[PDB]
């Protein structure tokens, strides 16, 4: 859309904005996803969405070996921007996320609700030019939807415990939990 210098400077400024927002909101309670009973036999969260109907997501597509990390949206956004501007998985600014070609399709799925919760994104910690970043196996557009709608905290899926703990370290609001253990807890309690 513009030149490289433009795109790098813009990303830089947004990261700096996030740095400050994160520093200000530090320690304050965020709105958490809520594990809810549902018509299926799966883990489903209700996600509050500011000035918007509730969203619902599910870990139905996860492996027993996967781990869930509840992430601070702003921190996740920042780590994604740390991928840089040229990556094929480069993160658009929030204001530009709805322009993404898959975004209407994502918005449509999110519109349905508890009858069809959106499966979690599969992400991974990584290293880019000597710094921490997050990249994707899948779920980039649904991640944009959540970010652009200012969902405060949402779950994501990670391939293994160490990767999950690393994600939680940099962008998490709590320790990870293995999908198999969460499914079993939901079973025994709900
Ligand atoms: Cl599930």
């Amino acid at each position: 859309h513009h030149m490289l210098l433009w795109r790098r400077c813009r990303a830089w400024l947004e990261i700096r904005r996030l740095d400050k927002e994160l520093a200000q909101s530090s320690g304050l309670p965020l709105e958490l996803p809520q594990i809810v009973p549902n018509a299926w036999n799966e883990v489903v969260w209700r996600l509050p969405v500011p000035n918007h109907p509730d969203a619902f997501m599910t870990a139905s597509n996860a492996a027993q070996s996967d781990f869930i990390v509840y992430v601070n949206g702003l921190a996740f956004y920042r780590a994604w921007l740390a991928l840089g501007v040229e990556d094929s998985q480069a993160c658009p600014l929030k204001q530009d996320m709805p322009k993404d070609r898959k975004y209407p399709s994502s918005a449509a799925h999110f519109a349905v609700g508890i009858d069809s919760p959106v499966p979690l994104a599969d992400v991974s910690p990584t290293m880019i030019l000597g710094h921490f970043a997050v990249c994707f196996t899948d779920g980039m557009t649904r991640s944009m939807w959540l970010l652009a709608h200012e969902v405060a905290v949402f779950p994501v899926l990670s391939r293994d415990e160490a990767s999950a703990v690393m994600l939680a370290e940099h962008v998490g609001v709590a320790a990870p939990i293995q999908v198999s253990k969460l499914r079993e807890q939901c079973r025994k309690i709900l």
Side-chain angles (χ1 to χ4, degrees), residues 1-186 189-190:
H1 34 113
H2 290 85
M3 297 260 78
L4 183 58
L5 178 63
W6 172 288
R7 287 192 275 107
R8 292 213 235 195
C9 288
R10 205 164 205 223
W12 186 94
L13 284 164
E14 184 74 337
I15 290 166
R16 183 213 184 236
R17 186 194 98 178
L18 291 167
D19 283 344
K20 301 189 174 300
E21 291 173 359
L22 283 164
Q24 289 166 1
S25 71
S26 183
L28 297 179
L30 288 179
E31 305 229 340
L32 281 60
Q34 304 170 336
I35 288 177
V36 288
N38 56 92
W40 333 109
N41 178 3
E42 61 189 30
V43 177
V44 172
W45 298 266
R46 171 189 173 256
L47 291 77
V49 189
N51 310 126
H52 187 280
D54 299 339
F56 293 83
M57 302 190 84
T58 180
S60 68
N61 292 179
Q64 290 285 90
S65 62
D66 290 332
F67 279 73
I68 287 154
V69 184
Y70 298 110
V71 302
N72 179 319
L74 292 187
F76 181 90
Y77 182 23
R78 176 179 182 273
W80 189 359
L81 285 166
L83 267 198
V85 292
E86 335 180 59
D87 209 291
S88 78
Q89 300 197 157
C91 184
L93 292 185
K94 242 153 74 173
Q95 53 187 266
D96 296 321
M97 284 174 187
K99 295 163 209 270
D100 183 277
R101 71 122 172 144
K102 304 172 78 220
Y103 193 97
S105 173
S106 185
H109 194 181
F110 270 109
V112 173
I114 189 133
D115 291 342
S116 190
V118 179
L120 300 184
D122 294 273
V123 304
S124 304
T126 194
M127 189 280 298
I128 293 293
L129 295 179
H131 58 255
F132 182 86
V134 299
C135 60
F136 291 79
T137 292
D138 51 57
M140 278 189 296
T141 318
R142 72 200 68 201
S143 294
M144 295 182 193
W145 189 94
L146 294 158
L147 287 180
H149 283 88
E150 314 275 0
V151 178
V153 178
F154 50 85
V156 295
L157 288 170
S158 169
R159 218 175 299 140
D160 56 79
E161 189 171 22
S163 297
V165 168
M166 206 178 308
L167 286 164
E169 175 185 351
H170 293 270
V171 307
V173 297
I177 184 170
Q178 184 168 352
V179 167
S180 66
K181 181 171 185 288
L182 185 58
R183 279 172 176 162
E184 149 173 45
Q185 285 179 335
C186 286
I189 293 308
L190 291 185

